[PDB]
Each structure stands twice: as C-alpha cells, then as structure tokens.
Design a protein around this ligand. Structure first.
Ligand SMILES: CCCCCCCCCCCCCCCC(=O)O
Ligand SMILES: Nc1nc2[nH]cnc2c(=O)[nH]1
Lengths: 261, 238, 38, 247, 238, 238, 38, 38
C-alpha cells in the first residue's frame, strides 16, 4: 500500500523542507506532513493497477485488413509492427526499451457483400526471411516449420502465445540511428523491426458469391519489463515507419493567466 | 470422460483477462536478460517526477516557450491582483492536464493522494522577493484578494539562495478518490499566487523576471481505474 | 501451469514492486529533506 | 557542497557554484561484465587515452536563442583518441560524464534545461520524406517557429521528437539557473538494448540545452554569454578491430 | 458436472502445439528398438561437420566441379589482388548458403556463435606457400589491399606437411543473435584471402594449384527461430 | 487433453446461479471499507420493525392520513359491533399488504412464524377504556358478536399509563408454511376488535379518540420462496 | 477459487448473520420484556 | 498422461541430448587439438 501520513504539529525551527533547488536535478521528497499540520491517517490505497503489467496488459487492436474469397486481394499481409494503430502505439512509445512476450487474439468476421457453407481461416506466420506466398494456392501455405492457426467460424477467437523473439535484450520503441554504417538509408525504428509477415486467407477453395472477411489482431503484452521512461506523445501519428509530426500546441489555451472556470 | 458444464462467458474474448494460451514457438530460447539502466516497474514512479507546468497558456503563447514562464514584475500597479490561478485537478485542468502528472493520470478514471507544486524562480541573484502561493478547497468562489487567499493552505515563499519552493496540496477530499474527468461532486480547489511583498531589484538588473512552475505527485499518490486517453484522437489510416 | 513454455503462462499481475529513487533523486551527493539543498 | 572537481585521464574540471552531479537513473557506468557480454574477443580498454574531458565548440546564448542539441557518441568523432578508436573498432561502450557550463553575473537572469535524452529519434520537417544525416549532426539549433524542407523539425515546443518540452524532465537532466549555479554535470551509464553497439550509425543519446527562461540583462552587462559543453566518456571499451572507416 | 469456462483458443488448430490425442490403434505392439549406428539428436551436430564451400561460383562454373576449387597460382602479376572475398553471413551469402552450415541455418531465422573456415591446400608436396586469410567486421568497406586486411582478425598460414588451416570467425557481434536473412542491422563481416608471400614450386611440378575451402560451426553455435526454407520452391503437383 | 463430456445445462444462462466469472478489471484496488451505522444483513431484521397499519382504508380515506387511525368513541350505540376486522394473512389482505411486514413478504411465496399486532391508543390522558382484540383461526365465519370472538386467542387490554398493547398472533397452522397469495388451503384467521367495557372520558376532554395500529414479525418468522413483487407494475419506458 | 481477483468469485450465499437489535430496540436505556416500559 | 497408449502422448520436446563426436571426429586414433594431425 501507499505511505501513511504521519501526524505533525506546529513547528518553528531552522529546518526547511519546503525550500528546495530544482536545478539539482532532484525532485523534493516532501510530504504534506512537512508543510502543514496533519492528522494520522492510514492509507489502505495500493498502486497495484498502475504497474506496467496491469497498464500494458490489455489486448489492443494492432491490425485490420480485408481479404476476399472467390489475385493478391484474396489474402492479407501485415509485416508485423505496433505502429499500425495509435492507441497502443502511444503506450509503447512511452518507454524507450521494453521486453515482453505477447499473445495475439484474432477476431475474424466474414460479411456478404447463394449461402456461405462455413468459413475456415488460416493465419500463417512466416519468420523474417521465409518464403512468402504470392497466391492462395501458393504452396507456401503448407506450414512445415511456420507456425499457423486454423480457425472455423462460430468458435472462440484464436489465441496463441508468442515469446520474446527479438535479437536484442529488449524491443526498442525508438532507434535514433541509421540502417547502414555510412549513416545512410532507413532512419528510425524501422531498421530494428525484423518480425515476419503475417498471412491470412480462407482455406475454403472458393465460394458461390463474393465473401469479404476482415481480421482484427489484438496484442496483449504480458511478463512486461520496461526501461528508460519517456514522455507520452503530444502530436499525432502521421506515418507508420517514422516518428514524423506536425507541430501542435502543448496545452489547451486560456484567456488570461488568472482566468479560471 | 469427466462430466463438465459450460457456464456463461464461454467462448468469449474479454480483452482484460488472465488466461494461459498455447505457445506458438515451443522450447524457444529467449535472449539472455541484461541489466539496462532505469527500469520502471510502476507508472507512479514516473508521475512523481517533476515536469514544467504551462501556467501561462493564454491564447497565442501555447505553441511557444512563453507558456511555461510566469511573468513576475516590479512595479506599483496590480499588486492586489493574482499572479496566476488555475484548477487543482490535474486531469481536465487546461494548465496541468499535459504535465507528466496529467499524462499518466488521463489513462485512469480515479485518482487519490497529494500533489505538490514546485516553483523555481528564474530571476537574477540580486533580485529578491516574497510570494504567497495558496490553495483553497472548493465550496466558495476563487479568492479575489490576498486576504481571502491567505485563509487557505498557503505558503509565504522568501526568494533567496535556495530559489525553489514546494507547495504540497494536502489532499483535502470528502471521498477516498476523485474523478479525473470534471464533475461537480469531486472537484479540486484553486491554486492562486499573490505578491506577499514585491520583487525588489537593484538599479542595473533587469526588472522583469519570471517564475517557472513544476508539479509532481507525492508518495501517497495512486490511480485507480484504467481507461483510454482522450488525447490521441486518431483520424484514420496512418 | 498447464504448459511447459514460460511465454505460454498467465500474466504476473500480482507482483507490485517499485524503485522511484532512480528517477526522483538520481543525484550523487545525498540530499536530506530537512537540510537545505546547497 | 557547491564546489566540486572531476579528474579524468589527465583532465580535471573545476566548478565552484554547481548542483551535485546527477547519476543517470542511479547507475554509475562500468565495464561490461562477463555474463552480459556477447563478443568473444578481448576488448580494448584505453582508460586514460579516451576516458578524459573533451571540450566541444561553445555556443552564444542570446535573448531569443531557442536551444541546441548534440548527438553523441558521434559528436565526439575525430576528437582525440576517442574518435580514432571509433574508426578502427566495430563496437563500443562509454559512460559520458557530461559537464555543461554557462557562467553569468548576478545581474543576468535565465534558466537552461540541460537534458540527456536516450534515443531522441527526431522528426522530419516535411512529414512524408526522410532527411539526410547532416541534418542530425556547431550544434544544430532549434527554432521558435516551424521550419519546412528536408530537415529535422527543430521547433522547441515539440522538442524534435514530438513531445511536450516541459515533459523532458523525466530524463536525467539538470537546470542552469544563473542565480544559483553556472554548470550542470550529468553522468550517463551505457543505456541501450544491446551490450555493445556501433558508435557511427547509432546515436545513444542527444544533449538538449533549452532556455525555458530566456537570457535577460540591461545595458552594460556582457552580451556575449557562451555555453560550453565538456563531455568525457567513462569506462569506454571497444571490440572488433578492422580497417579504418572513412567517416 | 464441474462448471467449466471456454477460453479463447478453443477449437482451433495451432500447428506447433503440444497436446495429447487419442490413439487410433490402441495397445499397439511397436517393433522392438534396435541400435542403428549414427543417431542424430540435434541438428547442430550435423551443422558442425565440415562441407566444401563453392567459393568460385562465378557465372559458368556453378554447375560443375570448378565451383569448389579456388585458383591459386605462381606468378608476378596480381599479387596485390585478393584471392577470394565473400560475405560472412552463412544464410544469404551466395557462397556458403548451400553448405551444410547454410542448409541447416535456412530453417531458422536467428543464429548465434562462431563459424570456422578450414582451407585444404590441394597442390603438390613440393609446392610451398604462405597465405593471409582475414576477417574484418562490418562498418567499413571491403579491404582492397593486404595492408587494410591485416588489421582484421587474420591468420598467416604456412603451407607444409599439415596442409590445412582453420580460420575461426570469432563472433564479434553487437547483439546475441543475427538474422539469417540479409538486413543491415545485423550483417556479418568479410572474409578475404591474400598472398602472404607467394606459392613457390619446383621446375617440374605443375605451377597452377588450388585451395579447397571448408566451413562448419563451432561448439558455441546455435540457431533460434524456426521458419521454412526458401530453397524448395514447389511449383505444383508432383 | 483430458477427455470431458458436456452435460445438459451447458451454455445456458440461469439467472439464479453461483458461478465464478473472469474479472473485467484485474488487480482493482477497491475503496477501503468504512463503518456505516445500521448495516442490515437479513430482510427479516427490517420486517420485525413495527409499521403503522392502514386499518381504516375505506373508500375515500386511503389517500389521506385517516387510513391509519381507527375511530373509537364513547356512546351508547353500536357497542355490540366490531371496531375493526380484517384478514390475518399479511400478503393479500387489503389492510396489511402494504406494511413493512407485507412489503418484504410479497417478494416471497411462502411464509412462516408468528406476527404480532401492537395497538397504540392516541386519546387523552384522562380517557380510560378496555378493549378486546381477538384472533380466531379459520374454519368458521367471522365472529359477529363479542361472545363468539372471546372464544379465540384474545386479549383484554386495559388502557392506562402504558397505553400500548401487543396481540401476538400465535401461528396456529396446519403446515409449516403458508402461501403469501390467497388460497383456501392455507388461509389465516380473522383479527377483530371489540369494546370490552367502553371508553370513559371526563366532561372537558374530547369524546372521540382513535387507536393506532402496528404490525411486525416475531423472532420465529421466516420467508421461504423468492418471487417478484406485483406492486411495481411498470407500464413502459421511463 | 480459480481467479486471483476477489470480485471474480462466487457469491457468499452460505453465510447467515443478523443483528435485529439495532432496528427493533435502538433505545439507550435497556427495556426489559417483563418490566413496564416506563 | 490421460491415455494408456504411449503413442497417444505429448511430444518430449523438453529433453536436449547431443553426441557430435560420432560425426565431427569419427576417427579411430584420437586426435588432440593441441598436437599436429600427423
Ligand atoms: C500464427 C502465428 C502467429 C505468430 C505471430 C508473431 C508475432 C511477433 C511478435 C510481435 C512483435 C512485437 C514488437 C514490439 C516492438 C516495440 O515494442 O516497439
Ligand atoms: N567514484 C565512484 N565509483 C562508483 N562505483 C559505483 N558507484 C560509484 C560512485 O558513485 N562513485
């Protein structure tokens, strides 16, 4: 639980808890027990829900794309990144380095644009450098060593656990550096993002009518370790492969410095 | 086999659940753990760090540096007028909703504990002064005079070698938690600043100085109910 | 624990640890609350 | 406890009005351990030739100057033997005692933010392109406006990385308040996701100096008030000897 | 019976799972186990075995035997030119992607450890020489002179009765693993060979010899992330 | 995995079940428990509290205060007529279906135990009297004379300083429970009041007084089968 | 108990407690059943 | 183990054994790393 408030009385002494120096890089450790007179109160309040495991440990949408049954629009491809969607990006771009292993949950909803029999979906994950399919009868789809999930509709959503598959000791949300050694090529965190593409298709061979399925991937980080905290993002998220921004006001404005509602 | 019974909540996907799931990559050898400096294990570690507060966020100064600095002068006029004044609730207040205290607070619905406001005086070494920074709990209007403001939890801050002062807002609340959003039932008080005496400056020093404000949480601060932040406001595909 | 893999496990939400001393006061020379800063 | 001295590898630093040194995240830098290492080659540890104070070019602080940033380790290339061991080695660590120093009178006022930000991934001025490497690295200046072109977005309110500039206090930092101190010393342990990293293509941290309260003085006081940065790597070690790189 | 709750991931088919399944042939009497020579229990047992490296895979020599043999001659011309040069990463490099080290490495996404290159000299017993085989980590260009190449981890190999030499590439990497595919962040160095002195041959012996190259893994070598190999590339029904 | 068998009742939603369900807000820090005065842990705590009984609920007096007060006078006429008379079953009886005993009883289908009727006399301090309040179990008609009513469980109540009397209806039933709804098989008796002697008043005091009635449960009272109350009768959207 | 959270638990229907003394007789001076009220 | 049959069991992924001596050095006469080969 959080710290209790000790009782204090009227003080007149040469000690000064309120007097500080911010220019020391030091945040004052004073309590309301140092400035004013306080009563003894027992704080049973805990900080259990502000921890990194409880904060980041909720499944956020990271990818939506359509793929149709009955060409290259017959299946989906994602080339995994957190940066597709803004709300989980701002939570992950809040720590510089963070080490977690995630389980992903797919929400696959087929919609008709004559009766669909039943739809079974395949979510094949190729690690980086593997063979990519260019067609639905690719030959790549047989998953000898690629992980893959087969899911028929009307069941629970497909949840599988993923380990910490990074090369480095932590995932890097930010990479202030270049791709090539001559300081050339791709700038930013794109260079570090080597996680394989994600391929989703209907294992149904065809359909009598045009059926368009959409997939929704929900990462939920667990076993989370985060290092070097940084301020949350202020300006919006124009790109996915770079932290580019239009300059925005730091805070909402007032009419005067004294003005208050 | 063993007879089972499927209860409600089967075959659902609750986003905030704690279940075990089959690993996609069995017997995976993770990268060995290494010690990186500065591990954060709780978000109230990084809400208790100071952050400069844009108190002077008037129209035309927000997209600049003049939003952070509080104009404090030496004169005969307007010494019975507040230096600044703003809401004490760090979630919806248009001054400290963007601070590190307010950024980590907007992911939550409820908050408890004492916040403290640190004031760094950025004048010359020869310029001296005294200021009255006061907090008045709700129930009455904003203090309009220094007489009405010295009835709340205030501090008279002599400006000298230390050059910094902490006003600890002491968490005078009816309930154990307050709403981060603005509602009348749980609304924080008012933080006003006044001239205790004046700023006195020597003949050759610059007569217009400014106070720089800070805000952070105390050790008894806690947030309670997770929600999404309203700031990001994605418009569409990136 | 119904699986052998460690990544295929429940989230360890229960544990609550914190070290705010590495952010609020990272200074070398110890600074006492009572004493003046300089 | 205002006077302080720092002696590294035949170069000492004297200050008499200063805050105490800030150790980044409470960790003092050190050599890489045997259990956290990754390269089975004997590292080069020239403790006195490289781990010493290097003094960068000083910058003039004016009434309307927005700020500056350096990018280290790279800014320390071709400076002494610390830059020569970059060109011949593939890997590197250090611990960077950063001593920013800016003196004034008792009739000057102003307040700088000397903040070290790990992985300050900057943003391009035009949101749909990428900018050259000479934009990132006479330190680059911020602007109190909005620039456009093939440049880093060097506005001050969004400090280049697209955050609130008042929220840069979360990083290891100090303030140079001209009434209190005239120097700010920050010690930065090796912060990276990897035990050793190349020093050219990767910028471990950037040093942002941003005047929150601008410089002000009446007539007669000295107008030229320079800011000098004196950075000294600590516990620097190198791995992967090869031919010298031409950069 | 006992109340149960169906979580997400029910009624799915994850290909890489570890579940028990009902036997189709209960109480089956398997054939008794017999000792067959040469049991392999780990694929890094058969990646640590040498394999001849097609270094001379120039256009027109790959579908032949001349791809494996490295031309080394005795002359006055081109003694300041490399004998060979290739990428050190055994996954995508057009020289050692096909070796036993590279065949077992392309089923994986990450790899760690030291590789070693063994050079068998296939000349006459009277022909002697000395060669400089060097490894230079990335960051600079390919070494263009023997002066620039003797700054990397090299070996001067005297050719005599032993007639074979091992260059152990010492795993100088920033991270714990490297990508098998070619990406700039984790790219291996360069392996160049140079004439230390020359090949000296008696009057009656053949003056054009050739070095035969090998490559295998060390005892600290490991592969980390299973994937499919790109080589097979099935076109259709067999 | 473990072979299971889905029984009937799977994937249903029984409203009155006792199952565990996944928490939507994990590791939630609830507000600390505080002591509020007057905790009720059982609804028979608040059915055993008295409540004024609208005995005089004749047409035209219900939406008023005259429904609660029982007219008792001093005269020569109608002293062989009952003062009041009503059904003893507190669920459907048009007198005590609305009391606190009857409000908490209409959420239930079965009820057991003794009820007690308390009679507060609200006359002057000089006016004295005696009353016969009787309970007669079912099987015969309502008692039409005081002779027939003094054969049941009655009480002769002298009115003096105490000014209050309790008639405990003693739970004379065939079965262990009775139906709250009105059915012939389990119907309670009749509660009639009679003049034992008269109300005698001095010359100057007001000659028309009134008795105020109460009703509550005893310590052996219990309700048994939960159902919905018929009173609310929602018509539509609010 | 298959969940860590306390709100994610079965209803504690089994327990049966009651204190009708705080409603039926909340008076300060004790009132005996046998004795007169005043 | 919920089944009697041994083929109806989980894959024994946990065990990690290896004998690279039967492939890398299958020679009869022992060859020391330090000594010359012949
Ligand atoms: C059907 C198999 C699915 C397997 C999917 C594997 C997902 C790879 C792991 C997710 C990448 C996480 C990257 C986070 C980096 C950051 O925090 O910036
Ligand atoms: N000189 C010095 N050495 C250390 N080693 C670990 N911490 C320290 C420190 O704070 N100062």
């Amino acid at each position: 639980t959080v710290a209790n408030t000790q009782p204090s009385g009227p003080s007149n002494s040469t000690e000064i808890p309120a007097l500080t120096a911010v220019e020391t890089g030091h945040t004052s450790q004073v309590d309301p027990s140092d400035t004013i007179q306080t009563r003894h109160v027992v704080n049973f309040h805990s900080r259990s829900e502000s921890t990194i495991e409880n904060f980041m440990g909720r499944a956020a949408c990271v990818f939506m794309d359509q793929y149709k049954i009955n060409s290259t629009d017959r299946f989906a491809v994602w080339t995994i990144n957190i940066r597709e969607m803004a709300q989980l990006r701002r939570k992950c771009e809040m720590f510089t380095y963070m080490r977690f292993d995630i389980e992903m949950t797919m929400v696959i909803t087929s919609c008709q644009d004559q009766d669909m029999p039943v739809l079974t979906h395949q979510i094949m994950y190729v690690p980086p450098g593997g063979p990519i399919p260019a067609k639905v009868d690719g030959y790549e789809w047989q998953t000898s060593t690629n992980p893959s999930v087969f899911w028929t509709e009307g069941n629970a959503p497909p949840r599988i656990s993923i380990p910490f598959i990074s090369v480095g000791n932590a995932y890097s949300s930010f990479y202030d550096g270049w791709s090539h050694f001559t300081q050339d090529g791709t700038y930013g965190y794109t260079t570090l993002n080597a996680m394989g593409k994600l391929y989703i298709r209907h294992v149904n061979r065809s359909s009598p009518h045009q059926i368009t399925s959409t997939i929704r991937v929900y990462f939920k980080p667990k076993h989370i370790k985060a290092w070097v905290p940084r301020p949350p993002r202020l300006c919006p998220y124009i790109n996915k492969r770079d932290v580019n921004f239009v300059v925005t006001e730091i805070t909402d404005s007032r009419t005067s410095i004294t003005d208050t509602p | 086999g063993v007879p089972v019974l499927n209860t409600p909540g089967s075959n659902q996907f609750l986003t905030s659940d704690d279940y075990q799931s089959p690993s996609a990559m069995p017997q995976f050898d993770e990268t060995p753990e290494m010690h990186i400096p500065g591990e954060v294990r709780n978000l109230m570690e990084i809400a208790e760090v100071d952050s400069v507060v844009p108190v002077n966020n008037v129209t035309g100064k927000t997209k600049s540096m003049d939003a952070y600095q509080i104009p404090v002068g030496t004169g005969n006029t307007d010494k019975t007028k507040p230096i600044f004044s703003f809401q004490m609730d760090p979630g919806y207040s248009s001054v400290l909703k963007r601070t590190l205290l307010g950024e980590m607070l907007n992911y939550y619905a409820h908050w408890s504990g004492s916040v403290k406001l640190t004031f760094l005086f950025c004048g010359s070494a020869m310029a001296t002064g005294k200021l009255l920074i006061s907090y008045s709990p709700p129930g009455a209007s904003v203090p309009t005079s220094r007489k009405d403001a010295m009835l709340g939890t205030h501090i008279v801050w002599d400006i000298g070698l230390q050059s910094s002062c902490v006003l600890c807002v002491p968490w005078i609340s009816q309930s154990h938690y307050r709403m981060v959003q603005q509602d009348p039932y749980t609304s924080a008080g008012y933080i006003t600043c006044w001239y205790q005496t004046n700023i006195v400056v020597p003949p050759g020093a610059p007569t217009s100085c400014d106070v720089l404000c800070f805000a952070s949480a105390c050790n008894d601060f806690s947030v309670r109910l997770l929600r999404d932040t309203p700031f990001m406001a994605q418009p569409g595909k990136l | 624990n119904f699986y052998k893999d460690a990544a295929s496990s429940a989230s360890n939400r229960q544990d609550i640890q914190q070290d705010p001393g590495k952010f609020t006061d990272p200074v070398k020379d110890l600074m006492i609350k009572t004493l003046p800063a300089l | 406890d205002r006077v302080r001295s720092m002696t590294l590898g035949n170069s000492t630093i004297t200050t008499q009005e200063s805050a105490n040194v800030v150790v980044g995240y409470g960790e003092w830098p050190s050599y890489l351990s045997d259990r956290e290492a990754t390269a089975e080659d004997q590292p080069t540890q020239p403790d006195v030739a490289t781990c010493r104070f290097y003094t960068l070019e000083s910058v003039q602080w004016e009434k309307t100057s927005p700020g500056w940033w350096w990018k280290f380790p790279e800014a320390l290339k071709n400076m002494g033997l610390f830059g020569q061991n970059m060109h011949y080695h593939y890997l590197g660590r250090a611990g960077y005692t950063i001593h920013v120093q800016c003196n004034a009178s008792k009739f000057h006022q102003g307040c700088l933010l000397v903040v070290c930000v790990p992985e300050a991934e900057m943003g391009c001025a035009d949101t749909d392109t990428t900018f050259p490497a000479t934009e990132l690295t006479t330190p680059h200046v911020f602007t109190s406006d909005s620039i456009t072109g093939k440049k880093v977005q060097a506005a001050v309110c969004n400090a280049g990385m697209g955050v609130g500039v008042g929220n840069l206090t979360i990083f290891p930092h100090q303030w140079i308040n001209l009434r209190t101190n005239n120097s700010a010393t920050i010690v930065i342990p090796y912060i990276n996701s990897v035990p050793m990293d190349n020093m050219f293509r990767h910028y471990n941290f950037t040093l942002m100096i941003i005047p929150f309260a601008p410089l002000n003085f009446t007539d007669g006081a000295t107008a030229y008030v320079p800011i000098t940065v004196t950075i000294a790597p600590m516990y620097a070690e190198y791995n992967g000897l090869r031919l010298a790189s031409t950069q």
